[PDB]
Structures are given as structure tokens and as C-alpha cells.
Amino acid sequence: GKPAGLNAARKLRNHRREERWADAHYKKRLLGTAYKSSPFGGSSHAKGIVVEKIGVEAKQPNSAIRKCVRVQLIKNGKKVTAFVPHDGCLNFVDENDEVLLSGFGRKGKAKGDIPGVRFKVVKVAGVGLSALFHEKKEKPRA
């Protein structure tokens, strides 16, 4: 098994360092995937420019239209997808609305039955969510 000598620290350290790359967590954290390959740069939130709206089909055993939106990030111009939490707000969220996006919870993995979605809308046009659904605050003029 593992060496158990009083002067085997170099062997133990070298083996631990070499095998540490096997773990997905260590590999991700040290390869900088959260900045290079990720749509963000490690940011918790970001702003984007809306492109269009997509009714992505739901995988088995479900089948639904989730009124997601295709957005273009302001800082990079790349095209990604976003999810609208509130119901029936598709008419409220239009294109080129200067939307605000955040993560979903799995740190870069698809949610539920909809493949290709990792970001959700937190604020839209600067008015935010949770207000246009209860009619507490209306959208501003543009």
C-alpha cells in the first residue's frame, strides 16, 4: 500500500498532487473553467440583451412550453438562454429589454427537463421581478 517511512513525505506529497487532478471539483477550480469556458467570468449576476423567445420542449416524462428567452450578454456578446420564473409574463418581457441574469443553483448544469438552460431573469428593464406579476410596480417607458 502507501509508503510508511519516516522520510517518505516527498513520495506521499507527489502522489497526492498527481492524483488530486482526478477529482472534478479540483480540476474545475484549477483549470479556470468558471472564467474561460463559462458564459460569465465567475460573476454572480450579469446583464444581457434579449434576442428572441423559445418554447423549448420538455423531455420525458413531461412535455411543456417553458417560454424561455434567448439572450445576448452585454459584456461578451455571446448567446445563451434564460428562464422566466413568473407565469404568463412572456408578453411583459420583450426583446432588447436590457435584462439581468443570474445562476440557477447547479453551478452550470441544466435544470429539470429543459436542456440548455442555466440562467434566470432577476431584473428586467431595471424594474425587477415580483412586481410586474402582482402589478405593484409597472414597467418604465423606453
Partner 1 sequence: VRQSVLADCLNNIVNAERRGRRQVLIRPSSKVIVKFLTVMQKHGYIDEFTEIDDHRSGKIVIQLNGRINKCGVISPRFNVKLKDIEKWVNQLLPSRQVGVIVLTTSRGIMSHNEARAKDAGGKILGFFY
Partner 2 sequence: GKVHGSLARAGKVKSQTPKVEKQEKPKQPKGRAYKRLLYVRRFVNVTNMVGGKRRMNPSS
96 lies in the binding site for RNA (CB under 7 A): no
Instruction: Give me 21's grid cell.
Output: 487532478
Residue type, 64: A
**Rounded CA separation 88/90 (Å):** 6
91 binds, among partner 1, partner 2, RNA, none (CB under 5 to 8 A by kind): partner 2
Among 87, 134, 135, 141, binds partner 2 (CB under 8 A): 87
6 lies in the binding site for partner 1 (CB under 8 A): yes
22 lies in the binding site for partner 1 (CB under 8 A): no
Query: Among residues 5 and 42, whose Cβ is nearest to partner 1?
Result: 5
Q: With contacts defined by CB under 8 A, how many residues of the chain interact with partner 1?
A: 3
56 binds, among RNA, partner 1, partner 2, none (CB under 5 to 8 A by kind): partner 2
Distances in Å between the alpha carbon of 133 and those of 41, 85, 88?
31, 10, 9
Minimum gap (Å) between residue 10 Cβ and partner 1: 14
Sign of CA dihedral 30, 36, 38, 42: positive
Minimum gap (Å) between residue 34 Cβ and partner 1: 38
On the CB side of 83, how many CA atoms lie within 13 Å of its CA? 19
Instruction: Give me 33's grid cell.
Output: 473553467
